[PDB]
């Protein structure tokens, strides 16, 4: 559609070059395209010039006998033409596929090795909107547009160089429609693009009616907005009628004028070209020729002006690849080393982190686990008992202060030591559309089915898994949609178990679980934690009292600690939070 | 069945337009089909003969031809403009009035997500289906078909070339489309692979990354990438195959038609303009068979439109006031269920049976049950959102079936699980139970619903954007924000959907206590799987898989209700 505004370019020659370099490997094939497009276009000049010295040569003196000898030129010429488009066209059809391939492995491989941050960020529909039309707007414009853009530069120039070779007049003549093409184009081209945004703008609101009252529906009908709603419609969609008319006049006469221009040069050519052959100053043939010219310069002066405009759109978008190529990687440090079979001892000294670096969310923590004890992290929305986690997996890193594992700070361990010693169970982990033995083995890849059903069972999941579809085979498509909440809560315990890390982390919501599977997710928990260190951001009563230690946080300040029974006395903050919801 | 609906009746007001712009478009037709054989008089008539009358008088008439098929097809484009535009304008609006009186099992049928793409996408489909029937559905079969007009009426046994250059051409059509239609398919299955992979790795990816199984999701996007990139390659070798082809076909019909014009004019049966004029017509009809074939590519897409919007356009609203529906004034909040089941699909077993309950005006009563067990169905009885497959529900000793729906519903105020604002302002949101509401009103309630200080610190407060959806807030003041909008409404019956998820425990308590103060007079029901916030209840209304399993205090129910014990088991 109509571009809004031309890109703005942090030096496009630099990505250019970058660009360029992607088309290295495979330059002697990009240079046999450049002259299949440089030929096939000349020939296809050459084409109404025969037909014109056929007229001149084999019909108008009868001599008929020199007809098989054009029309076997003509038909070579032809033959030619239609071989050198599918080479050129199956050449570079294969030759950027083969790039686009390179920067979807790229940009890939650049997800798995970026900082978690900017998944947090921005939104993961945006992120991939915009990647992949960036990505098919350079293969667009590689695998197309640049050539086209190329044979319409040849072709128009072969054409105007054999028109002024034949006739100068004529040629001033056929010549005089390009500037009424481009006067014309240029005003209903504004106007299109104008009109196209105003519709858009319209569009867009109506659109966003449509979605929002369909979505809430059930409000709207409680509310008895109806008639409101109806009322809000129709003003909106009277005035999309009157804008998307003339949205689509605009749009759509830009092909009659066109046409007329065509018409225009060819009654030209036909009327100042009989009255030159009148004259003996051009032959009849000429006048063919000349026809065979009368819509080079309405349509693919166009094609031009806006292939150039695809090129330039293709440019910022390959600026926008590379930066995103260019982005810092989580790597790790020489002196980083792999971690000793410990226990599991986990430590914070001072520590202070935020998101966004204005709005502080953790001050000042500071507190020591030992090997084996269940920790319960409790506190009200907006403490950050969850920011614990992305911390201590190194999601993110700490501004003041330290975190440590077994003596050794945790920013000075490889991360891959780091995430195989410590599992970690969100709130709302993540499944994969594969079957459930693939997804439990996600975390032990070289474990037998066999050994899974053994650890299956003590988990309480065996039981549902072999009781579905296909039992370990049922492939949950939609990362699985079609199992309660409840079971896929399992999964993730019964996968965080194969891995077998000495420190744990976990979230297990209570919320929408049966009565049944949560007596069986809880049993689940304790033989989860049986062997290892747990940190478990609790909402079960039974668990906040069997806890080796409770921290207490509020407000991004750790306030208090010790065991359930010491911190009901206190009267303080835990007192409070465990009487106004457990006081029944 | 289904219904005799047609969306040939959106285009009959306009049938003017819809009749000047194939009309104005024949007249570029003629006006097109005339330049070459205007071109044949120049040279047959004009040169040949030594006069420049003819070739300057002629010459002049193919401009004003030009101009004239110009004024052809402006007019043609925006007479079909119009056409088009004022069909889909009146489309959408019967889609939208048909849409806003559906019923939860109407939705449930056409998917809420099928409902939106329907009004949205379908109806441009529509409205360019229009558009082009209106321009060129009218101007390529006339070219095409003029074009072998003309040819004939040139020299009718030079069109035998034509019997020739048409059939491969129609057969290098079905060719291309019966086999590059499930290689193009297959590009679409493969794209969503490539999506997928990408997606699930940014949902899921402190799940690969803690796993250590970044290198295993390269290998598996490898696959989506090399499968798309081969899906790709062997669909588009068809197109890069089929342009050439198509050209060089039309180029051998020029080949033809002066080779076997050339054998026609030596016998003195065919001048040279008209040779000119021939290969010009030629290609003409060639080009229009292209344009006919593409065309035909685009109705089957666009058909499926039509079927999509005709079943909307013939769904019948589950939900119906009666004739002779009784006026509720006012209500006092008495609400009684007698034997009631229900099923949303007649496949499965109900999710609602014989539920027999009532509750007397005033009262607070907990619906409490674990997931799954019908609290939300239950309550949606209350106002006729769905109705009772077996046994009637009952406000006020009264038969809602038989009572108005805007006087019913103006007396319930629900607060929906799932929580939807709308565009505008804070307060246009919470005055849509009242538009006469005064901002003493709306302050009170929003002080109840513990929400007025969020909103007092927002920079232009109560006047504060609510975007689509009021997805610039969190699940937890958007919760508020419709509880606050439940009670400004003044209600005589009040339920609140599980609507204590996304608050802190403790602001729970603020928000439930403020009620009694307000809602003094007012039949309350709070649902909620557990335990401590149905305490807050006077009554608790227990459901256990779909069925009443107990309906009294926690001393009661503790010792008789065993689903009511297991509950207790789960949480304490
Ligand atoms: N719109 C719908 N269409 C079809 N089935 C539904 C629909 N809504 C709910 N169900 C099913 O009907 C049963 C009862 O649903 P519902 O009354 O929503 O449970 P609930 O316990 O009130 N919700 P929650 O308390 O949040 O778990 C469940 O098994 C649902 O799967
Ligand atoms: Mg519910």
Known sequence: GPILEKPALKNPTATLRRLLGYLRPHTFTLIMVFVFVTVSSILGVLSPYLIGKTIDVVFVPRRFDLLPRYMLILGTIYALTSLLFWLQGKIMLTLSQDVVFRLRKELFEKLQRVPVGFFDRTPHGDIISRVINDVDNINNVLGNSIIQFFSGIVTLAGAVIMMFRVNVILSLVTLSIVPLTVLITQIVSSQTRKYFYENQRVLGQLNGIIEEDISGLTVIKLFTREEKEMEKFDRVNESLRKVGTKAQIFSGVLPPLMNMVNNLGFALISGFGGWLALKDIITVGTIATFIGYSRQFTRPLNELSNQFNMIQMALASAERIFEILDLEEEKDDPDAVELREVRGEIEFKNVWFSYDKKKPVLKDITFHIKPGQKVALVGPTGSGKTTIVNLLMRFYDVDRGQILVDGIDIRKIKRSSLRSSIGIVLQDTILFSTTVKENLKYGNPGATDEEIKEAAKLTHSDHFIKHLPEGYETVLTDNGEDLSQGQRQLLAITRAFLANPKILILDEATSNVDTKTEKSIQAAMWKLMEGKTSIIIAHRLNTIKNADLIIVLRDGEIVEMGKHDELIQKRGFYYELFTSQYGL | ?572
């Open chain 2, 1 to 572: 069945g289904g219904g005799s609906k047609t969306l040939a009746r959106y285009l009959k007001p306009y049938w003017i337009f819809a009749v000047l712009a194939p009309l104005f478009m024949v007249v570029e037709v003629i006006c097109d089909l005339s330049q070459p054989t205007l071109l044949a008089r120049i040279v047959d008539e004009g040169i040949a003969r030594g006069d420049f009358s003819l070739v300057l008088k002629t010459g002049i008439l193919m401009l004003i031809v030009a101009l004239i098929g110009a004024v052809g097809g402006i007019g043609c484009t925006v007479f079909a403009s119009y056409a088009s535009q004022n069909f889909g304008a009146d489309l959408r609006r019967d889609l939208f009035r048909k849409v806003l009186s559906f019923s939860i099992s109407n939705v449930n049928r056409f998917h809420t997500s099928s409902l939106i793409t329907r009004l949205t996408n379908d109806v441009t489909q529509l409205q360019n289906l229009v558009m082009m029937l209106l321009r060129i559905v009218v101007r390529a079969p006339l070219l095409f078909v003029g074009g072998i007009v003309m040819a004939v009426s040139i020299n009718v046994k030079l069109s035998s070339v034509l019997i020739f250059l048409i059939p491969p051409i129609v057969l290098l059509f079905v060719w291309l489309t019966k086999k590059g239609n499930p290689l193009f398919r297959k590009i679409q299955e493969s794209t969503d692979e490539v999506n997928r992979v990408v997606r699930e790795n940014l949902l899921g990816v402190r799940v690969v990354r803690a796993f250590r199984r970044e290198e295993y999701e390269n290998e598996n996007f490898r696959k989506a990438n090399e499968s798309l990139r081969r899906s790709i390659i062997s669909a588009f070798s068809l197109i890069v195959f089929a342009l050439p082809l198509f050209i060089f076909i039309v180029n051998m019909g020029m080949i033809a038609v002066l080779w076997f014009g050339g054998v026609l004019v030596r016998n003195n049966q065919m001048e040279i303009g008209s040779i000119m004029a021939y290969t010009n017509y030629l290609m003409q009809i060639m080009f229009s068979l292209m344009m006919i074939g593409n065309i035909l590519n685009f109705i089957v897409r666009a058909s499926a439109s039509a079927k999509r919007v005709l079943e909307v356009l013939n769904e019948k609203p589950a939900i119906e006031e009666a004739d002779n529906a009784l006026a509720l004034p006012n209500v006092e909040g008495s609400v009684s269920f007698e034997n009631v089941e229900f099923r949303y699909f007649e496949n499965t077993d109900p999710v609602l049976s014989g539920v027999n309950f009532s509750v007397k005006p005033g009262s607070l009563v907990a619906v409490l049950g674990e997931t799954g067990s019908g609290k939300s169905t239950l309550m949606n009885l209350i106002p006729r959102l769905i109705d009772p497959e077996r046994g009637r529900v009952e406000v006020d000793e009264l038969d809602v079936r038989t009572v108005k729906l805007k006087d019913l519903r103006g007396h319930i105020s629900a607060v929906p699980q799932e929580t939807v604002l709308f565009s505008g302002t804070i307060k246009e949101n919470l005055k849509w139970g009242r538009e006469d509401a005064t901002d003493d009103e709306i302050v009170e309630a929003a002080k109840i619903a513990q929400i007025h200080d969020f909103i007092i610190s927002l920079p232009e407060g109560y006047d504060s954007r609510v975007e689509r959806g009021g997805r610039n807030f969190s699940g937890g003041q958007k919760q508020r924000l419709s509880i606050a909008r439940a009670l400004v409404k003044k209600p005589k019956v009040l339920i609140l959907d599980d609507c204590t998820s996304s608050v802190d425990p403790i602001t729970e308590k603020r928000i439930l206590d403020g009620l009694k103060r307000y809602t003094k007079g007012c039949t309350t029901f709070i649902i909620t799987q557990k335990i401590p916030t149905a305490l807050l209840a006077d009554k608790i209304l227990v459901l256990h898989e779909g069925k009443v399993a107990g309906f009294g205090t926690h001393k009661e129910l503790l010792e008789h209700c065993k689903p009511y014990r297991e509950i207790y088991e789960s949480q304490f």
